[PDB]
């Protein structure tokens, strides 16, 4: 029997941020603590929405001191704030990181049990919801909006830890393109291929089944068609890419990943590599190593990436699939090795340990062991 | 801007049930009012339920009072069943009519000004959340356990009314196959054809865009390739059922349907007719009234219901998709013509002015006239 958590309400498409005064109008929510990050603040992404509160005379205190990888840190600071501000709800502005963030606030916060943070790792035992959250994205993205999961940085223990939580789940998502078109192009690129490996994983993950299949094959088709418009700076692909991401969110959070997300984390945790880079640069080399534990389902991703597989064997298929990614990475400018990032050959073996103890993992249809996580990572980091 | 509303929770497969009565307890409900009819206790469909729920300690009284096309005297007398019960929450268990009365006595529970009942016509403008909702159908299906819509019949006015409001939403769907074996093959064929109504009007509405176009297409492959082998009794072509027609809900909820349900309403006021039987012999009709109307969206109907449409123009594809919905009526035993249920000639009029009139019409591709619904229903009436 299989388990769908979903935002109850979504508002989708250029404009969706004009429906949040009249969300919060319904629901009797008094004030905000806006949760986002420095460059957002100053790109006046965060303006279009505190503008909008203002005219409709909803009161807010804002949080802009999330980092890329948010840290135990980042998180205590905030929950510090959002007890002196005295708000009743939260507005995640931003990517992954402001998102997981303004999660982590929420639970806690109504969960004061878990104040250390790093106690929320694996299947959170929360007995209480979120203090409520509308989320708005502004990268296309990690569907942080929809999905149950927030990943935070353990700068003590150098891990990313992932938290599991149906009390987690945002009350209203809103996804308009508007606030995403501000993204450089290396950053459409990479949480554009974040989008696609959350989709691929998803779609071969141990826990998958037909609901999830059907959500994923659909995003993987809408990525693949539409990112490589996006990084160029189309206006309808942005729009695209925002509604891609999102519906991946709604299978992966449900089912799982796999070992790209499990040795992407790492990456993260080390270097301090954006996800998007380090999830694209493994992508190709884990789709390769998983290739014959997923039947039939690498046709299928060939086919909607725009590959004819009217007549092809299925390893052919599955080397068509594999490629068809390395094209999609090279088109949009991502590095092609980890070396190429900053990874280091002295730190793998840490690194594959850590890969392998990662939540994610235990998703991916072929079970790793150490020895293969390490190969893996050595194929990814040369040249 | 588009909206989506959906579950929060839900959990599918054969067993599904079996979660009902942990969800309750991470919510700290204390006593549901189950709102169901009395073929489903008789037959142990709601013993299936409260059986779990004796064995976990959790309270709960019955309105059994139900019965096909609810009343406003039905919604009355359960309205007044669950103030004697004491009861803080509902439990929905059966087809459209119960789950729509569940919703109907949740929103007045909440929004008493709406006693009267026919007052939540329309965009319902109700302040308050219903009271909370857990849905098991025992059809496959309305989708009433995930669409934010319930229709009610007005006995004094002889018509039916659809209500649509978020705030009906259920809390939790409970989505079991074994809940829905005990269906006659003609309820299982009448109940089928409804869930493929609500994803071909809900793929072809005016409202329709890229999300709910990927979910109805979706229902449409999984029913055309399921409702034959699930009216012949197979226990895995009801899992797909089950599944079919919710993922429909997900879709139509949010855009709307058409002229078909808005020529079905007036016949189950009038005759008493099951919802899904009208639909069924309106459907193809309606849908050769609309083809010019649709783009190539008949092309994509006519394939995933098992034509080969490879080298058609697009006006032979749409004759093959109408041609393929006629075909699965005969095979499940739905009769050709209205004349066929009992309708009457004389009615038509009447019957024509109430279709205009219908909520679910203003979303027909085709804008409808008076004199165009007269012609269909003579069409529809007989060879
Ligand atoms: N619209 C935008 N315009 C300009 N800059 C932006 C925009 N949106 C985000 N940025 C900037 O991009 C950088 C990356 O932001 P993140 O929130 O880290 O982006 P994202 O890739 O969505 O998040 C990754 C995070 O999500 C988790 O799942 C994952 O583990 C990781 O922590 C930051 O400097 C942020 O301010
Ligand atoms: N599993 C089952 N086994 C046997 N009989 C069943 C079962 N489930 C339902 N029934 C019976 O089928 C008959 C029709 O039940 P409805 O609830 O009317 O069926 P459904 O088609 O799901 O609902 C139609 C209603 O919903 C609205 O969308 C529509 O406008 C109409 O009011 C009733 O006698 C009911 O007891
Ligand atoms: C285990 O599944 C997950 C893995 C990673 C994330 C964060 C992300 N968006 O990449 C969320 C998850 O869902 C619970
Ligand atoms: C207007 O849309 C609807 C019309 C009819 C219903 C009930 C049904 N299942 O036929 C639900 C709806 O969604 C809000
Ligand atoms: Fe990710
Ligand atoms: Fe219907």
Redesign the interface.
């Given at each position: 029997?299989?388990?769908?958590?979903?935002?109850?309400?979504?508002?989708?498409?250029?404009?969706?941020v004009?429906?949040l005064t009249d969300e919060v109008k319904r629901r009797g929510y008094q004030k905000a603590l806006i949760v986002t990050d420095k460059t957002l603040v100053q790109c006046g992404v965060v303006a279009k929405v505190t503008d909008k509160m203002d005219a409709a005379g909803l009161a807010w205190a804002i949080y802009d001191g999330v980092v890329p990888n948010p840290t135990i840190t980042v998180v205590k600071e905030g929950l510090g704030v959002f007890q002196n501000s005295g708000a009743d709800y939260l507005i995640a502005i931003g990517g992954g990181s402001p998102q997981d963030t303004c999660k982590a606030i929420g639970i806690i916060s109504n969960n004061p049990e878990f104040a250390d943070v790093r106690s929320l790792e694996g299947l959170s035992p929360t007995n209480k919801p979120s203090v409520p959250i509308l989320a708005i994205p502004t990268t296309a993205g990690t569907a942080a909006e929809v999905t149950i999961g927030y990943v935070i940085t353990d700068e003590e223990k150098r891990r990313k830890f992932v938290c599991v939580d149906?009390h987690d789940?945002p009350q209203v998502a809103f996804i308009?393109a508007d606030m995403m078109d501000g993204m450089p192009p290396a950053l459409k690129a990479a949480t554009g291929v974040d989008a696609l490996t959350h989709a691929i994983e998803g779609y071969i993950t141990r826990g998958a089944?037909?609901?999830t299949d059907?959500l994923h094959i659909?995003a993987i088709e809408?990525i693949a068609g539409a990112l490589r418009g996006s990084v160029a700076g189309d206006k309808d692909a942005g729009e695209?890419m925002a509604?891609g991401q999102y519906?991946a969110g709604m299978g992966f959070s449900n089912v799982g990943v796999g070992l790209v997300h499990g040795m992407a984390h790492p990456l993260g945790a080390f270097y301090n590599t954006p996800h998007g880079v380090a999830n694209a640069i493994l992508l190709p080399h884990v789709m390769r190593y998983n290739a014959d534990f997923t039947g039939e389902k690498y046709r299928d991703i060939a086919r909607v990436m725009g590959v004819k597989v009217e007549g092809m064997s299925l390893e052919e298929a599955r080397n068509a699939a594999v490629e068809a990614v390395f094209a999609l990475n090279r088109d949009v400018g991502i590095p092609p090795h980890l070396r190429d990032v900053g990874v280091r050959k002295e730190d793998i073996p840490a690194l594959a340990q850590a890969a392998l103890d990662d939540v994610c993992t235990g998703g991916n249809p072929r079970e790793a062991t150490l020895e293969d996580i390490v190969e893996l990572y050595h194929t990814a980091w040369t040249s």
């Open positions: 029997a299989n388990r769908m958590i979903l935002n109850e309400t979504a508002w989708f498409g250029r404009g969706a004009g429906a149906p789940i308009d089944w037909a609901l059907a659909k809408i695209e509604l519906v």
